[PDB]
Design a protein around this nucleic acid. Structure first.
Ligand SMILES: Nc1ncnc2c1ncn2[C@@H]1O[C@H](COP(=O)(O)OP(=O)(O)OP(=O)(O)O)[C@@H](O)[C@H]1O
Lengths: 277, 1340, 251, 50
DNA sequence: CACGTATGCTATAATGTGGCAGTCTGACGCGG
DNA sequence: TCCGCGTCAGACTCGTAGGATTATAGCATACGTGA
């Protein structure tokens, strides 16, 4: 029989009212006053009109089935707010809604990285300005050439052209040969390999030895300040909370701990060796 | 002979004089794209076709319409020079004139209401170079010609769909250029079916009903008629004697007076002539005979008016008696025969569930659009739209041509749509083949495989641009206001531009030109593929396609194709092969007129080759006459045998037409197995050009042809004397005869100097001519990177010796002397391009300054203040080429770093580091640096110093242009002035600016002075705008990607030397890795002392069966022997007469040498410049199959005072004692393949990690570990080695705990197993849970 | 995740997920409106199309094609066949302490020996240099040992040379047919980017010196050093397991 | 072919003798690439059960 | 209040969809 | 049970190179969090 979701729905609309001028008014007048059945009909009837409106709004964001569904929601909001008393027809008023609801729902579900309407709205005018220029310049317009025709900022144009880039999927094959995708190449940022993991472990274990090689009162105000042994990274003035309670003596003893430690790095074989790093 | 030829002549062992000279090898690419841009007035081709096809476009209402007028190409925005550098398409503006015409609605057709007309841009088309390349984003790229099934009709049969029945089911299929497919096919019960688009299977009479055909007409078309007369009482029947042929007499066959055949007897040819000569027309028959026969037309009772029996119904005794008494004693029935005229349509109609025309269009509609309720128009519109509308369907010219000649038709040229006739004619020949007459076509014949070059494909992709515009035009026209809306507001320029760049980029045929060798460029442009879109696939590819087909002869090369799964599909074009005007291939052939082999040549199509018998080029001509022998070995009908003289109709022109370019360069190919010949020609393309171009001593002659036609060299447009020689450029003065009278006549050739290749190798053009040398028109002025005096120079020749050496030449392993390495002769050049990008991050913009945090003064030593390394500065891995810094944001300075930055200090600025530094391992010399900046942010001071040079160098370069152009322009006027008013010095007193002031008498030459005077001014005014274009494009800010602010591109220059691991080979597929560079002390050497260069393994020869290399060696030695004799006489400083006698004795030796070069014609000076180039070795040409034989080579060896054998007395260098017995020594022209070991070796301990799999990455490109696949795994399972595997599953790969933990344990010394469980499995758990499946790890 | 080029990249699952959530939320909206059933039907058919496309795209009907006219990779696809997790990212793995290079002949070597380039074994045995360095007291920490190696100073070659002695390395050639497709040897450091292999075991690999490459692997654990010397050593592997016949035979 | 190749590699092949040699050469090397997957797939099949 | 993001409304009549795929092959089940 | 239509497989490592197009109107009223 028929097993395409497309042709099935398109069949069910093909057996639904095709209303006259005075018919539309009869149903619509009852639809506003809530006849229930009336709101169902006007909608059922004009599903055929939504499809012909979604025949031109395809290949832009979603599929044909997706456009129709959204387009139907526009016909419904048109039915929620139609004026039968007015001598003007319905098919005219409903078209304004069905063209709007489609464009708007395409603006959201077209791009992966969600873009609000405001940054998008503006982008359109920048792009539609590029059309005019391109045809007469016969050269795809620059960020400047667009800025000189609108007389608007340079970074704005460039800032609006930075949110119109495409996104290559991670699982996309590479060079007319699905040998490897981008995931088999693209690196992991977070975790650096053992060599970088053991760097910090060995460097920070060497410091634990250098802190036990200094004076007891020299490694008590030096680490408790930087937050090496203590719990919170304090300042020269804040070391007074512990037992130091000093401002001058804290600053002299902090630097006295660092001066004896600078000679511990000159003798072990670092100093200028570990200065590049 | 010419001057550039006089410098060095190649001894040709050809004996088959070239009647056809090798054509320009790059014919297809250039001629194809020429058609595409060519604005043909009527005969639409390329763009002109694309517009007339789609246009005129009219609105959906049909009140407004857009009409195509004319188009044009503007000159390129950026020329090739610039395009290659900047990095954007070398394209031309497309300006097309459109006309918007609108009609009156209530009025008939008010065509003259508003005829709006304007010109509109849409898309920029990449142009083709003179090399047949497209510059896409600064890359010369090549579009390979495609090979696809030619449209029209084709008859096939699956030799056993159901081997159950094992019945050969025959089928036909109409293949259009555009449109739906139309197939006809039989079935186990021989019922004809039709399957449009191979969709549903529908009875084949349903399509005929759709063409308005009643049951009667159908039968009347296919089947013949059998007449039955019921006279008085005796039933009678018309007999054509030729009908009851090969059948059995089921009844007693008797006539006006005679019984011919008895019941149950076979009617032979005797009985048929017995009846036919007796002139038998009528025979009385029994009524039992009709029971089974099918009635033809309808038969209504004259009386009642009802159908007694409908058409196509098997008769019976009672039906016949009902018809005899109705009043019909003239009955028509079908001529059914199970053997010849088969009853198929008849049995098919019994299956056919349709009725009339309108009902036949229903099931056709219910097939393709199932579910939609059918109307009169929807059913009719569909079927009419399929194969019967000017829109949907198009067979094309080739389609209709092949379609017609497949049906043995009347027309070559006809309609693009299928007519009723066409369909039934196709069903008819399908049924002919089913009967017995007619043979099926096969796809492998090149008569069915059409070639589609770029220009036709560029046309196709340009149509989709127009088709995608058609949509936007119609919809905007109808609902949009008529007046206000302009035609360019409805046009979009992006869909065309995007659809064309889709082709020039993403397509499988658009690929980066392989230009690591002149041979690679020319053979890669002459590549022809069956793959990509509208072709075949490795997944889909069979065998018989790949297999060499006897049509390939002269058209396609049998030995030119990758040995990769894309083996038989990809193929190079033959040497003298060319495209048929329609699409097929064609090969040159010498016509034989009345026995006389005439010099008139005819390019025979793939179709007509089969017709005539074709003699081979091995056949001997009688010096203007005919074949010397009465019997001639020839070939035809795709087979080979001997024939008589008068029977020969055509003959192979040359002996090299079977092979390609790749194969025409292999000498003694005749003595080489096709398997090794293929590999040899495949590796010859991979031959990286060497430092010093060395000519091949053992060539074929095709050498020069390749080097010249490749477009890598610079050949003279006009002959004359080289006024000026230079490393950068060449200036040549033209002779009077060739020089035009208008212009000055001084050609300019700015030679391409050292710059990059697509394979990262050297590209140079050195002048091969001396200052002030007389040069003939079409002579090579500058040599390329792999060319020498115009001849191709791919690799280098050297003294080789075939013998084992302590296993250093084990399996084809190579033992090369240090002396080769000392001459740096196989040392190669590699220009590597690296870039530094200043981006715009979220935090802020990046810049390029010398100010870099965490750095040594040692690193910023080679940089300047701007932050770019000096030109000529040596660099090594770790040194920084270009200083870059990016913004540093909220950065958590770890306590241990805040303390370390507080101790030693250097509170690094809020600006991150990412300077471009030489990649770890590379080291070269910077030869140039180029800076690209957006039109905006102020520049680096170095970027200003480079602008200084470009400008002041361009001001000089243009000053030099107008200066020398002035001198050549007044040089003419000076000669014109003497003719008439003859005065020498008195005219040359005052300066030359007041020479246009002087004139002549009323004469042609007075008009000439006015031409040169106002052309001097034309150049004087032209010089300013030439300066403007240069100045602006230097001041112009180069457009970049969004986010990028400026870029700095560096060019390094690496000199890699040969070393163990480097791969080299001959041209006979003899491969090998260099194992050891032997000391000069250790190299074997002859009694005389000179050592050997390479020592090859003799065992890489018998098994290989590529004896061509040995012949290359022997001839090379002989050739060198002659050079060694000439070298000695030139060193001894002997005489011109002595060299003349010996060299004349050398050129003339072969049996019938093709070239007969007399040296009495050569002047003394011309002989000594020749001998000076002959001393390295007399270059020899061995045509592919007409090469030199033993008799000639051994005779040459006697001239060189070399051994007849070719084996020399060798002595071991290590020791000094002789080897036990002689070894073959000679000069083999070997090559240095691109597969160099510096570009291969890799190592990894720990590095990057994958993104989700959390195993290491892949390749030395990204620094990745080698893959240990499942096969590699089972090996350790077999050993039993359990940890070695678990170690390679966890700590070496995923196990995040393991890898870091194990590292720390190794540095501790404790190499301890510490597993956990790879990440990639923990992924697989959640991935199956995401699929809605409870997969948990059940514990102990 | 974002590219270095300011671009982003997303897996096709995210895209397939947005098709499911959008249609599911639109159904919530239409059930709020009490819309006619004919529309609710389409929405439910759509929802199922999206769900089925998320689990296994190419199965029920046409697989939902995306940007480059290719089909979106679904869930099932990452568990399915070669390109699935099992065969590609679980039984087969890229491995650390691994390098490959053009091999060349080693006619001077004994059976239990193989040429290994210096700069190869350098990078391969990186954690073993840092380890032996802290022992001698030449490196105080590991980033100190890192720089010692980087500068390629003379005395670092002699330490690298120390650890490698009495240390086997695995040599693999593709394809790995039988177990002998990997054999272990005692590395001999050689100046040059070429690996030097023993002629007699060339038969097992089917390794022709016509431009072959062999993967190297370092056995880290002491058990792996014992396994390599005991089972996978070239001297302990003579006869083929297929036939009781010597595969180590001159040619 | 009814008529085989008379000559050898020392004597040299004529133009067809080579064209004839091609037919056998390319099909022999086609089965080196394509037929290998059935035999390597057998190795896979055997292993899993064993 | 404001900047960024969202929801909203407009009225001639208009009311059933539709660019490629190229066919691969030998094997083994699963509804009519 | 035969026909037919569907689903499932189809060697292992290495390489090269990056990557693409489109289009959703002007305007005002509105809802949400920091100052
Ligand atoms: N596609 C491929 N996959 C795997 N191995 C291949 C492939 N193509 C070629 N080879 C291998 O490359 C080698 C090419 O032939 P090779 O020169 O090694 O022959 P051989 O076995 O040494 O015999 P001979 O001594 O007669 O030349 C073979 O070992 C072959 O298995």
């Amino acid at each position: 029989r028929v097993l395409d979701a497309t042709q099935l729905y398109l069949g069910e609309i093909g057996y639904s009212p095709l209303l006259t001028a005075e018919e539309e008014v009869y149903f619509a007048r009852r639809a506003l006053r809530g006849d229930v059945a009336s709101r169902r009909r006007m909608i059922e009837s004009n599903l055929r009109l939504v499809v012909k409106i979604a025949r031109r709004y395809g290949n832009r964001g979603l599929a044909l089935l997706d456009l129709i569904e959204e387009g139907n929601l526009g016909l419904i909001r048109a039915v929620e707010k139609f004026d039968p008393e007015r001598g003007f027809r319905f098919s005219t008023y409903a078209t304004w809604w069905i063209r709007q609801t489609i464009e708007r729902a395409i603006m959201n579900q077209t791009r992966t990285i969600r873009l609000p309407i405001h940054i998008v709205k503006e982008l359109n005018v920048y792009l539609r300005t590029a059309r005019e220029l391109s045809h007469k310049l016969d050269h795809e317009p620059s960020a400047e050439e667009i800025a000189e025709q609108l007389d608007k900022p340079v970074d704005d144009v460039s800032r609006m052209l930075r949110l119109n880039e495409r996104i290559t999927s991670v699982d996309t094959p590479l060079g007319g040969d699905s040998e490897k995708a981008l995931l088999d190449i693209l690196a992991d940022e977070k975790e650096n390999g053992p060599e970088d993991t053991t760097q910090d472990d060995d460097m920070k274990q060497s410091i634990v030895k250098w802190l036990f090689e200094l004076n007891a009162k020299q490694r008590e105000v030096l680490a408790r300040r930087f937050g090496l042994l203590g719990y919170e990274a304090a300042t020269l003035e804040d070391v007074g909370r512990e037992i130091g309670l000093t401002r001058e003596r804290v600053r002299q003893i902090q630097v006295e701990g660092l001066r004896r430690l600078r000679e511990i790095l000159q003798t072990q074989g670092l100093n200028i060796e570990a200065l590049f790093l | 002979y010419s001057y550039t030829e006089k410098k060095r002549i190649r001894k040709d062992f050809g004996k088959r004089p070239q009647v056809l000279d090798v054509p320009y090898l790059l014919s297809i690419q250039l001629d194809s794209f020429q058609k595409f841009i060519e604005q043909d007035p009527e005969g639409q081709y390329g763009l002109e076709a694309a517009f007339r096809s789609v246009f005129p476009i009219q609105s959906y209402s049909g009140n407004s319409e857009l009409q195509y007028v004319s188009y044009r190409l503007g000159e390129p925005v950026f020329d090739v020079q610039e395009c290659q550098i900047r990095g954007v398409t070398y394209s031309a503006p497309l300006r097309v004139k459109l006309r918007l015409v609108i009609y009156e609605r209530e009025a008939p057709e008010g065509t003259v209401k508003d005829i709006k007309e304007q010109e509109v841009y849409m898309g920029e088309i990449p142009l083709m170079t003179d090399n047949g390349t497209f510059v896409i984003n600064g890359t010369e790229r090549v579009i390979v010609s495609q090979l696809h099934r030619s449209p029209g009709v084709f008859f096939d049969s699956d030799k056993g769909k159901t081997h159950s029945s094992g019945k050969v089911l025959y089928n036909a299929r109409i293949i259009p250029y555009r449109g739906s497919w139309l197939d006809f096919e039989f079935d186990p019960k021989d019922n004809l079916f039709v399957r449009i688009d191979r969709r549903r299977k529908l009875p084949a009479t349903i399509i005929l009903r759709a063409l308005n055909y009643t049951t009667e007409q159908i039968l009347d078309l296919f089947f013949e008629k059998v007449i039955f007369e019921i006279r008085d009482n005796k039933l009678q029947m018309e007999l054509v004697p030729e009908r009851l042929r090969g059948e059995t007499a089921s009844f007693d066959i008797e006539a006006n007076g005679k019984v011919y055949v008895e019941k149950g007897r076979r009617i032979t040819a005797r009985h048929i002539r017995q009846l036919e000569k007796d002139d038998v027309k009528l025979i009385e028959v029994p009524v039992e005979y009709i029971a089974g026969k099918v009635v033809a037309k309808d038969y209504i009772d004259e009386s009642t008016g009802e159908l007694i029996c409908a058409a196509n119904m098997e008769l019976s005794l009672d039906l016949l008696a009902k018809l005899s008494q109705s009043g019909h004693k003239r009955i028509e029935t079908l001529f059914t025969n199970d053997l010849d005229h088969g009853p198929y349509i008849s049995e098919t109609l019994r299956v056919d569930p349709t009725n009339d025309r309108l009902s036949a269009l229903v099931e056709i509609y219910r097939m393709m659009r199932p579910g939609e309720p059918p109307t009169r128009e929807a059913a009719e519109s569909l079927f009419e739209n399929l194969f019967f509308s000017e829109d949907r369907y198009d067979l094309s010219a080739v389609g209709r041509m092949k379609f017609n000649r497949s049906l043995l038709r009347e027309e070559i040229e006809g309609s693009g749509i299928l007519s009723k006739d066409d369909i039934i004619d196709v069903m008819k020949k399908l049924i002919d083949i089913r009967n017995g007459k007619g043979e099926v076509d096969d796809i492998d014949h090149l008569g069915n495989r059409r070639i589609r070059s770029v220009g036709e494909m560029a046309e196709n992709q340009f149509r989709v641009g127009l088709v995608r515009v058609e949509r936007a035009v119609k919809e905007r026209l109808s609902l949009g206001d008529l007046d206000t809306l302009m035609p360019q507001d409805m046009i979009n320029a992006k869909p065309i531009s995007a659809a064309v760049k889709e082709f020039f980029g993403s397509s499988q045929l658009s690929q980066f030109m392989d230009q690591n060798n002149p041979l690679s460029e020319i053979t890669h442009k002459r590549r022809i593929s069956a793959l990509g879109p509208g072709g075949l696939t490795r997944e889909r590819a069979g065998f018989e396609v790949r297999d060499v087909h006897p049509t390939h002869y002269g058209r396609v090369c049998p030995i030119e194709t990758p040995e990769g799964p894309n083996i038989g599909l990809i193929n190079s074009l033959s040497v003298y092969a060319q495209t048929n005007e329609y699409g097929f291939l064609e090969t040159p052939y010498r016509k034989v007129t009345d026995g006389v082999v005439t010099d008139e040549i005819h390019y025979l199509s793939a179709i007509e080759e089969g017709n005539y018998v074709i003699a081979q080029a091995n056949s001997n001509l009688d010096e203007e006459g005919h074949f010397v022998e009465d019997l001639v070995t020839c070939r035809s009908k795709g087979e080979s045998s001997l024939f008589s003289r008068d029977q020969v109709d055509y003959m192979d022109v040359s002996t090299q037409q079977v092979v390609s370019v790749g194969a025409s360069l292999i000498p003694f190919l005749e003595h080489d197995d096709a398997n090794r010949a293929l590999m040899g020609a495949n590796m010859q393309r991979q031959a990286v050009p060497t430092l010093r171009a060395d000519k091949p001593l053992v060539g074929t002659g095709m050498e020069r042809a390749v080097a010249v036609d490749s477009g890598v060299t610079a050949v003279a447009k006009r002959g004359g004397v080289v006024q000026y020689v230079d490393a950068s450029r060449i200036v040549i003065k033209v002779n009077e005869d060739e020089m035009y009278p208008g212009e000055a006549g001084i050609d300019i050739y700015n030679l391409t100097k050292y710059t990059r290749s697509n394979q990262n190798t050297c590209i140079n053009q050195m002048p091969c001519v001396s200052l002030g040398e007389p040069v003939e028109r079409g002579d090579v002025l500058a040599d390329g990177p792999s060319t020498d005096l115009g001849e191709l120079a791919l690799g280098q020749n050297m003294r080789v010796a075939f013998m084992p050496w302590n296993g250093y030449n084990f399996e084809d392993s190579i033992l090369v002397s240090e002396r080769v390495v000392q001459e740096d002769r196989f040392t190669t050049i590699h220009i590597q391009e690296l870039a530094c990008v200043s981006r715009d991050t979220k935090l802020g913009p990046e810049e390029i300054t010398a100010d870099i945090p965490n750095v040594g003064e040692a690193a910023l030593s080679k940089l300047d203040e701007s932050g770019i390394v000096y030109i000529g500065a040596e660099v090594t891995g770790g040194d920084i080429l270009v200083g870059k810094v990016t913004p540093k944001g909220e950065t958590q300075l770890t306590p241990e770093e805040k303390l370390l930055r507080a101790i030693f200090g250097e509170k690094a600025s809020d600006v991150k580091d990412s300077s471009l530094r030489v990649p770890n391992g590379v080291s070269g010399t910077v030869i140039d640096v180029q800076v690209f900046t957006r039109d905006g942010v102020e520049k680096d001071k170095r970027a200003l110093e480079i602008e200084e040079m470009q400008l002041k160098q361009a001001k000089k370069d243009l000053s030099e242009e107008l200066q020398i152009l002035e001198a050549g322009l007044f040089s003419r006027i000076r000669a014109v002035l003497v003719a008439g008013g003859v005065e020498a010095e008195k005219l040359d007193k005052l300066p030359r600016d007041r020479w246009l002031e002087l004139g002549l008498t009323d004469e042609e030459k007075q008009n000439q002075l006015e031409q040169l005077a106002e052309q001097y001014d034309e150049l004087k005014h032209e010089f300013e705008k030439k300066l403007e274009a240069k100045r602006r494009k230097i001041t112009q800010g180069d457009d970049l990607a969004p986010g990028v602010l400026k870029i700095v591109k560096v060019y390094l220059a690496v000199k890699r030397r040969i070393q163990p691991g480097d791969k080299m080979a001959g041209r006979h597929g003899n491969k090998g890795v260099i194992s050891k560079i032997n000391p000069i002390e250790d190299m074997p050497y002859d009694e005389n002392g000179t050592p050997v260069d390479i020592v090859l393994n003799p065992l890489g020869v018998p098994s290989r069966m590529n004896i061509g290399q040995i012949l290359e060696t022997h001839l090379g030695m002989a050739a060198k022997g002659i050079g060694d004799k000439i070298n000695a006489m030139l060193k001894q400083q002997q005489e011109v007469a002595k060299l003349r006698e010996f060299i004349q004795r050398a050129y003339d030796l072969g049996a019938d040498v093709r070239q007969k070069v007399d040296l009495s014609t050569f002047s003394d000076e011309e002989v000594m410049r020749l001998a000076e180039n002959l001393r390295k070795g007399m270059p020899i040409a061995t045509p592919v199959f007409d090469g030199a034989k033993e008799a000639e080579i051994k005779e040459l060896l006697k001239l060189g005072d070399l051994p007849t054998s070719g084996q020399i007395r060798l002595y071991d260098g290590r020791t000094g004692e002789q080897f036990e017995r002689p070894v073959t020594v000679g000069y083999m022209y070997m090559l240095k393949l691109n597969h160099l070991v510096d570009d291969k070796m890799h190592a990894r301990s720990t590095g990057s990690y994958s993104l989700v799999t959390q195993q290491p990455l892949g390749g030395k490109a990204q620094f990745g570990g080698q893959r240990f696949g499942e096969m590699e795994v089972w090996a350790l399972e077999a050993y039993g080695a359990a940890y070695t595997l678990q170690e390679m599953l966890t700590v070496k790969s995923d196990d995040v705990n393991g890898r870091t933990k194990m590292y720390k344990n190794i540095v501790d010394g404790n190499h301890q197993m510490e597993p956990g469980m790879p990440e990639s499995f923990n992924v697989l758990l959640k991935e199956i849970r995401s699929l809605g499946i409870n997969i948990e790890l059940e514990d102990e | 995740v974002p590219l270095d080029g300011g671009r982003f990249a997303t897996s096709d699952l995210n895209d397939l997920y947005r098709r499911v959530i959008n249609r599911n939320n639109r159904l919530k909206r239409l059930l709020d409106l009490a819309a006619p059933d004919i529309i609710v039907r389409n929405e439910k058919r759509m929802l199922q199309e999206a769900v089925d496309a998320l689990l296994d795209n190419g199965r029920r009907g046409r697989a939902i094609t995306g940007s480059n006219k290719r089909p979106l990779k679904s869930l099932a696809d990452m568990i399915k066949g070669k390109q699935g997790r099992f065969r590609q990212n679980l039984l087969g793995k890229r491995v650390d302490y691994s390098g490959r290079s053009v091999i060349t002949v080693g006619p001077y070597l004994r059976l239990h020996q193989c040429g290994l380039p210096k700069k190869m074994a350098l990078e391969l045995f990186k954690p073993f240099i840092y380890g032996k360095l802290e022992l001698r007291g030449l490196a105080t920490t590991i980033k100190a040992a890192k720089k010692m190696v980087e500068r390629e100073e003379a005395v670092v070659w002699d330490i690298l040379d120390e650890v490698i002695r009495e240390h086997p390395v695995l040599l693999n050639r593709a394809p790995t047919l039988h177990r002998l497709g990997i054999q272990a040897f005692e590395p001999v450091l050689i100046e040059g980017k070429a690996i030097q292999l023993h002629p007699l075991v060339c038969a097992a690999y089917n390794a022709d010196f016509d431009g072959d490459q062999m993967a190297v692997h370092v056995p880290l654990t002491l058990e792996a050093q014992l396994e390599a010397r005991a089972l996978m050593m070239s001297t302990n592997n003579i006869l083929s397991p297929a036939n009781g016949e010597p595969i180590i035979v001159p040619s | 072919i009814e008529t085989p190749i008379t000559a050898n590699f020392r004597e040299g092949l004529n133009v067809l003798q080579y064209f004839i040699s091609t037919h056998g050469a390319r099909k022999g090397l086609a089965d080196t690439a394509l037929k290998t997957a059935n035999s390597g797939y057998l190795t896979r099949r055997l292993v899993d059960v064993a």
